[PDB]
Each structure stands twice: as structure tokens, then as C-alpha cells.
Amino acid sequence: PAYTNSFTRGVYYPDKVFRSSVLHSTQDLFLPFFSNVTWFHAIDNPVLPFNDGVYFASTEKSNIIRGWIFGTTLDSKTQSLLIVNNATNVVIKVCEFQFCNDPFEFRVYSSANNCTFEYVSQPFLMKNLREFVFKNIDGYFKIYSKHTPINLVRDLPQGFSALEPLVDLPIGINITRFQTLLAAAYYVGYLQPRTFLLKYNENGTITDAVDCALDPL
């Protein structure tokens, strides 16, 4: 539905190493430049097939987007990752939950069971460009976040976004399907293993990059 182009947003820091005025090439999963991201609308929220990574821009101001569902089967057996994010607390749990149906309060199995991982973080999570990236690598969930001051561009804000990593909580699940925990819209951008060239600035921030898969130039 009204497929918007990805442009050149979705670049993060592959590892926690400070490099300055250098051109390093990494073989890491990045969102390909000038791709297509579905313009899913949520004023509703079907099961988005999480394959290998999700680009979650979802500009909004009403904070209707509370959290994110991330489950393998979403019924039983496997553990379900839930990242409910209130005004301040961003409490996360991996307890086995059926998740019931679309939320608006715990719309889950309400049975707990395998309530093992219960990290809460707490400080904060949030001109309100969410700019989230999710991926599972060798039993490690990594979330990359950044806020962009955009209040005039309806489509994707042409430019660059050096996504500083947010947290590196070690968990593990296949997460075949996922759905946003809900007047705005949320895009999804699938992740592929594309070699990238990254130009770290003199201050250590990735000012620009080129996708080494797009065109022969």
C-alpha cells in the first residue's frame, strides 16, 4: 500500500570501536539503499513476517505505538519477547505468552511460565522519528535507535542517520512473525547481508556510506 522508497536511512554502527577519518568496509547486514518499505497504516496491524531484520521508522507524535511483539510461534513452546514501553519504563520480558489479540493492561497469556529474562532498563526511550533497527545475531538481540527532528517531510526524510546503538540484551528466539504493539503509520524494512563502505568522520560519526551492491558505480 503506497510503497515508499527507503532512500539512505538505516545505517548504524556495526561494532563498539571508535574509528576517526577512516574508510572501513564491513560485511554486515545493512538495509540496502533505495529499497522499498511497505507503508503499513495504523490509525490494522497484521502479522508482519520478521525474516532477518526490521527497519521501524514509524513517525508519530501521539505515542500510540507502545511497544513491539517478537515471537517465534506466538502461541506456546517457544519464548515470546515483549518490549512494552510505557511513558518511562521500557520493561522487557520473554515469558511464554499467546499475546491474545491486538492491544490498546496485559494482552497476553497471563500465565507467565518461563519468566526468565526480565530486564527493565527504565531511563527513557523517546521531532519523534523512532528510527529503530532489530536483528538477532548468535543469540544476541541488538536494538539501534535515533531521533530525527523531522516535522515537514511526509515521506522518508532524505538524508543520513547515524544510528547509535541503544542496547545489546543477550536473548534468543527465531521470531518468525512480529507485530507492532499499538493515528500514524509504520514501515518495515527487511535486512540483507550487503557489504558496505563506511566513512567515519573526524569525530567518529558515520557521515556517509555507499551500498556495495546497488550499481556498478
Partner: protein, 414 residues
Amino acid sequence: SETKCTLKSFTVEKGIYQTSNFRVQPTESIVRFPNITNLCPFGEVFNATRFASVYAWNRKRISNCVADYSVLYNSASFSTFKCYGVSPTKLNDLCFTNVYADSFVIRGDEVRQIAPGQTGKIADYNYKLPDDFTGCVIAWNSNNLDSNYNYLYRLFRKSNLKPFERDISTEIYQAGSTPCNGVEGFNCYFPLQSYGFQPTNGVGYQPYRVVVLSFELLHAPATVCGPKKSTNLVKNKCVNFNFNGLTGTGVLTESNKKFLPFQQFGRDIADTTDAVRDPQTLEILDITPCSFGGVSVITPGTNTSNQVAVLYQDVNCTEVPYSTGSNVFQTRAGCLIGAEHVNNSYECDIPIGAGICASYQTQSQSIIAYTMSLGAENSCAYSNNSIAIPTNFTISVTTEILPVSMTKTSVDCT
């Protein structure tokens, strides 16, 4: 004498010879390690009442704490304590992260754990361990202590075991073409076969309590690691720093960069360790290596005199540790020790560096260093309506030597 040994001869001709390399040596040693001192949960998966089954083991996530592997290693117990990628004696000094203790029980005969890539099918359907395994394997005898947690094992799963993957529910299995709609015996047999050896006395087959530790080495925040000590932090000194397990030698100095809050290790062009983060008090320190260069011996011929003048190639003036002749003098090609600077200029005798030359001057018989003279001044009086015509000649015969053919050598192979 060093120059004499370098040329493998007792006679040294006039010139400058490169002998040995200079290197500033460390004075102190820094073993800065994180603040954590509370002991790790060892014995929770070691001194436990029961362990898990091979089909469904337990993956305990050891977290931030001091892990004293020496207590486990030197204990007069266990067996087949084989550590892959690490040495048990050096297990304490290394500062790891993400050590995942796996506890479970197998049969007495195997005790293999798929160690390098072992093809044994006992654990080929139960528990596969990756080839690049930087951890340790420990096996314990359980005959005396309730030979009941042997439980069961996966007889077959018609599928290979992906490394470090756990399969729990295996009910449907078949070998014939008939679909397994709740039929086990006719098609073949149902999986998850049991093992009964809770008492008995069968030697060589008593259940073994096998626990493996899988450290994750290399660059990491290094949450859980060993019981080392902590030395103070000295700046602008050649030290043997050991930051969070990163061993090396260099001069740690207060930084100026803008290290991002999530970044730990600093690099630069060509990927060398330009910066580091201090584990106790988070601060960035640039690590430039201690200075070094090439020691050169400016010497006249030993037939003339037995005096020399050392030239350290790159050390400025103060990194200096013959060796000292009360004539230290800074050039553009490093510190020159043993020669006196003479303001007068002569033709170059022994080239040194960027314009500096050295020679043996009698008027005391000491080595002097000067700036080379290009040639004799011949200010020529140019003037119009004035030409100079020679009135005599001089037939001069010069010489010129040119090598033509080198020696013809043929070298056999076998």
C-alpha cells in the same frame, strides 16, 4: 665492537654502519581490571543434586562476577579437562565474557562431547558443539553419587544437529513410506529412548556428569572474568598495560577525542589500537608505543682511530637511555652522541642525515659534525662586451670502469 661483529670482520672502514635497533623498555606494569569482586555462581551447575538430560541440557548464563577457574582446575576430581583455544593454567589471567555453562549427563563410554568436530552419532542428534570452540570440557564420575539424572537420549532424529541448538519435542518419527500418524513400531520406532542405569555397577558405562564452559573471547565488554589485581594508572610512561585483558606495551596519555559512550576499544587507520577505555573509571587513554629507531655508528677507519659517534635514528633528545661522550647534539636525523658541532663547513666525509656530515678532524683528534659544503665559491664576473678566450690547452686522460658480465652460476635442485 658491535660494528665489528656486524660486518663479521676485525677491521672497520670509514663510514656509517647501522648496528642493532634502539628500544625504550618498560618501567612499570598496569593490570587495571574492573571493579567486580563478588564470586561467580560456581557449584550451582557443579555441586548440584541432579543434572539435565543430553536431549535437553541447561544453558546457565554466567554474568558479571569474578570467576576463579583455578579452584575448579586444581581440584583432585573430574577427568578429560581439555581446554580448546585456551590453556587451563592461563585460564585465570584471561578476562573473558559470555561464558555459558552447559550441564548435562551422557553415558560412560562416549565422553567425547563432539570435541573438535567429532562424528559420533550419540550427540549428533542430541548436542552438537561448534568447531571454533574457545572453551573447556570437563567430565565427572557419578557412579558413587546416584549413578538418576541419566534420564534419556535421542535415538534418532533423521536430521543433523546444528551447533549449539537444543531440540526438546521429538515424538513423530518414521522410516517407512507410511506417514507417522501416531504409529511408532510399524514405521520404525519412536524417538527419545530412555536409559536405565540409576543403580547398577557396570564399569565403563556409569553415567558421567559432563559440564562444558563456552567462553566468548576477543573484543567485548568483558562482564565476567578472572581474579586478578589492580595497579594504579600512570601517564606518559612506558608501561606494560593489561587493560581488561588487552596486553601490550606503550605510553598511556590522556586523550582528546570524542569516544562515543557505547564504544570501548579505539582504533585508527590501518587498524591499530589507538585508544582504550579504563575498566574502573571510564576514561579514554591514547596508546602510542614507546619510541624506537636505528642505532648507527659513525666511525672513522679503525686504522686511523678507535673512536665512534652513535646516532640514534629517531629519538629526539631525551628518549636516549660512544654511548655518552658529553657531546649530545640534535640533528634532523635523530640524536647524535659523541660528536661536536662545528660551525665551519667542509666537503662531506661521512654522510649522516639531512645535510649533516661527520669527519675526523685532528685540530685533539675528535669527531666533528657540520653542514656539508656544496662546492668552492666561484663568483663569475658576467659582463657584456667582454669575452674570455683560452690561450693554452691541457690534454687530460681520465678513466671509467664499467662492469660487463657477472659470474655464471648454475645451482642444482635435488
